[PDB]
């Protein structure tokens, strides 16, 4: 209805004053791009930015960053009146002053250390009366523009003189500082954070609406994850980006206070935050204040918890206070904290993943002035088990190396070291590797829940089985209208059975990767640890973990591992049942229908599998993953060799048919036997590092076939019965 | 408030609870409602601390101290009745108890109606479909399922505008209409909750859902219905009816449906104890949980308490050569103890079902226990036609496929083996429907392709074992 057409959004692509705007209509505003444009703020403020195109931007909204947003005093999800006018007029020698407390970063020349690279070729239009951010030399600072000769705005080129001041002045307190953390300062690309967005949008960005309409906004939210995974970021950066007042109930701060004034300090916490609305109260270490499990040593702690429960229920539906609370494990906190109206929603922050850990490594080194060679993606792989705090420490520890090395050899210093004397330091791969060596992670023990990186290409052969998984996994969620028609419920389970090494685990990961579902692998040593420790009550949390990670594929490796531990020829006198596989049955039947969770079992020995596993409503679909043939062997060879570079003379079609009965893993042995020899050559040749036809011949001298031919019959026999 | 009196300091915590009953004296009639009674009186004689000893004692005095002037009723809520102190149940304290329990499928519809009656729903969603998906949700989950589906549509439509004043217009919010996509999204984010809790529900399966088994159907009604409907007759001969029935037969012949259908007919609660649940008490060597299964049954009365797979523990040890031990073991022993200890037949009927009657502890079968052995055999093609018809009454079927022939061709199948075929063919129809748009109906050739995989679970030598066990029983 003649609407303007502007919405404000986070911008993931990394730019100082650049904007994306939707292709599905480029003709309404009609900007060729690179054309100076208006932006309408609040209060009487405006901004000027440059526009680019994105296939993956929405027709709905507009990618722009945190420096433009703070200038306008716009926020996310907000709308600013916008108008194109193409024109722009050049200007002179733009003038610059330090802003706020920040300063002392630069000693002497401060436009050598800062300006030259950023106004270079950019044509960054720069306004009177705005703040912007220059990064470099392990620090960030902002230069206000108080005086510009041409107005309202000026495009800049390096034909102009350079004027300098460099003396600080207090910035207005009403302003929102750019160091206060916000969405971009949170890394990991978990996308889970997007879930907290949907919860806190309306309640604390639109307070007056909930007095108009009956609905129940959530009062509490639990973040949980191991320490250092960014739980305090999320609260700080939701409260900062929405304008709500952030409060902080230090888990042990209220504990450090004496009996009877400990409650006084927590209760006034919610009373203050009442008066500020909307507000997030963020209790961290909730398991400090409310860790009672009905077990409860002591006295005082009974009363701290009760007061908190009253406070969390006592929220009086005047004002908006959202109470976010973080803890390491959700079993840790008192069970009465989850009742309706207390902490209703929970979020698992969890360990980041490989291509999640890249972003954290980008956010902690963006001021560091890196070397070219290291791209951070290589270190991102080595880093599994690290959490965002480990990674911020990996970077600070690699940044403190280079200071130790270069620089202080000089010892030259005054009350503040010059900004430029520290420019020549550039963090290097040797620094990072040294840093990786001293990390000490941490979270290695925690289970892994990740979208797996293996794809369909990584699987040679198995084309039909690949289709059949997509049938079982994808059609019920994509076409529920069809399954409802016949009243049929899809299967939740699949049991892979076959000889060892034929690609059952990759086949499970590849379908989770395709759906970009989380993958949780429970391995035979993990089912054996519950069985030797005769604690199968931990099966529930594996499942609870799966439910929280949904949509996921929950994969059980080696699901006969316990039947083997007893036997598997004559076994125990007992039948096929036992304590752990029994709980898996209990927890499959107890699942709340099929809700984003798909189960895949895999076994070498279907003989010894408890036949109750195979019943209707459990893992009904038995799929037989057999040994490859030489068509699928050519594909397996090609699929393994797609990484390590290969010299063209070696022939990959012949190696196949010559190895008559190998499993897929037996071909990995050969490929790994030959790549070993190439490294064996490369390192011995410099004391020409490529892989040769004769290595796969020397590798072949050791070629071994794991799966004997009598048992192939056992598989076929088990399979030939199954019809 | 259970924790409100707790939040107060020592010595003024009692002052606050005692004045609670003194005020409510002056107002009559009045309900005092203590919630989280297990906060104020959770002591089991275990009792960490000091203060809590005295909070509980004051409450006991208060609950006994009701002076028969005025009327004060004290209602108190708690999560499990074992949680609260045992002295709270003595005569004159909390004498009556009520189990509210999880709602059931056609119960959950009404909650979904009461929380969305202001919402201005779309036509398509009737709420009965979501009511089915919702098992494990409780009324609070469902009020949250609706508020979460109502907050979706506000997020979507509407605020795109941003038009607002001190109060948004009543009509500007009229155009928002909650949709199935909103609800499904909501179902996706519910997080229930109560999934673990045992299920006690009138089952939805009827007599029609059971092909065949006409005589056995009569005999259940005899055992279940006549003693309660005609107690004047059983008293005449001084005869006490049987409390139990043991179904025995091959796997998949409809023993579980037959148990649910008689509970459905009586509109009795149905409690299914499944073999993995008897195995969990046995591996965890906690059979003291058999009592609460029964206590739960007593509270749910009239119910049919059904034990699936009642030989599952005998198999876990053996079932050919077994343990050196005899047929007894810890869990089946408590079931014997708790059957004999039942307060007569009071709305609770027990049904055991087993595939292996060989390995059943013969003490199960004694007088006063599960005396009536009924043999549920494999169907014949009359009952196979009925089983086929009974399964296919839901999923729509195109008339050309012939259901009389498929029967007699499958010579030895159990009832569950025919479900495999019907499910094998309905799978292929969905296989067609989704691949045809990238005409969704079921065909005579699908039951032919389904039949290519047709498998017979129950071997013919063991049918003899059943008949043999049966042919002995006379
Ligand atoms: C065209 C494209 C750009 N659009 C966006 C991408 N989507 C991909 C659709 N992927 C879906 C959603 C995730 N999947 C998934 C993940 C994890 C578990 C399950 C799952 C659980 C489950 C339980 C059952 F009982 C039965 C089936 C089940 N599937 C599904 C299914 C495929 C395409 C459009
Ligand atoms: C005509 C119709 C409209 N009227 C109303 C509906 N009633 C139906 C009568 N249904 C009765 C009551 C519920 N039943 C029931 C439910 C659960 C358990 C038992 C039961 C326990 C038990 C224990 C024993 F030791 C022996 C027998 C037992 N039966 C009975 C029996 C049939 C008709 C009139
Ligand atoms: N996922 C992440 N992305 C970016 N930075 C992170 C992340 N996780 C941790 N950090 C950094 O390390 C610190 C994590 O500590 P904290 O916020 O206390 O996490 P938690 O609340 O889980 O203990 C933060 O100061 C933040 O700068
Ligand atoms: N079909 C296949 N395609 C590609 N690689 C395979 C295949 N089968 C086996 N492999 C290789 O052999 C190894 C063992 O396979 P795995 O997935 O562990 O099978 P399983 O779980 O059945 O033992 C894998 O690391 C993989 O690289
Ligand atoms: N007589 C029957 N009538 C209708 N369906 C049957 C019959 N027997 C078996 N079935 C089908 O086979 C499945 C298995 O039956 P079930 O009740 O589990 O028998 P059991 O408990 O003896 O294994 C049921 O879901 C049912 O749909």
Swiss-Prot record, chain A:
This is Transitional endoplasmic reticulum ATPase. It is found in: Cytoplasm, Cytosol; Endoplasmic reticulum; Nucleus; Cytoplasm, Stress granule. Changing residue 75 to G: In IBMPFD1; cultured cells expressing the mutant protein show a marked general increase in the level of ubiquitin-conjugated proteins and impaired protein degradation through the endoplasmic reticulum-associated degradation (ERAD) pathway; shows strongly reduced affinity for ADP and increased affinity for ATP; abolishes enhancement of K-295 methylation by ASPSCR1; decreased interaction with CAV1 and UBXN6. Changing residue 106 to F: In IBMPFD1; uncertain significance. Changing residue 171 to Q: In FTDALS6 and IBMPFD1; abolishes enhancement of K-295 methylation by ASPSCR1. GO terms for biological process: aggresome assembly; ATP metabolic process; autophagosome maturation; autophagy; cellular response to arsenite ion; cellular response to heat; cellular response to misfolded protein; cytoplasm protein quality control. Homohexamer. Forms a ring-shaped particle of 12.5 nm diameter, that displays 6-fold radial symmetry. Part of a ternary complex containing STX5A, NSFL1C and VCP. NSFL1C forms a homotrimer that binds to one end of a VCP homohexamer. The complex binds to membranes enriched in phosphatidylethanolamine-containing lipids and promotes Golgi membrane fusion. Binds to a heterodimer of NPLOC4 and UFD1, binding to this heterodimer inhibits Golgi-membrane fusion. Interaction with VCIP135 leads to dissociation of the complex via ATP hydrolysis by VCP. Changing residue 558 to Q: Does not inhibit interaction with RHBDD1. Increased interaction with CAV1 and UBXN6. Impaired autophagic function. Defect in ubiquitin-dependent protein degradation by the proteasome. The PIM (PUB-interaction motif) motif mediates interaction with the PUB domain of RNF31. Keywords: Acetylation, Amyotrophic lateral sclerosis, ATP-binding, Autophagy, Charcot-Marie-Tooth disease, Cytoplasm, Disease variant, DNA damage, DNA repair, Endoplasmic reticulum, Hydrolase, Isopeptide bond, Lipid-binding, Methylation, Neurodegeneration, Neuropathy, Nucleotide-binding, Nucleus, Phosphoprotein, Transport, Ubl conjugation, Ubl conjugation pathway. The modification N6,N6,N6-trimethyllysine is found at residue 295. One of its GO terms (molecular function) is lipid binding. The modification Phosphoserine is found at residues 17, 442, 682.
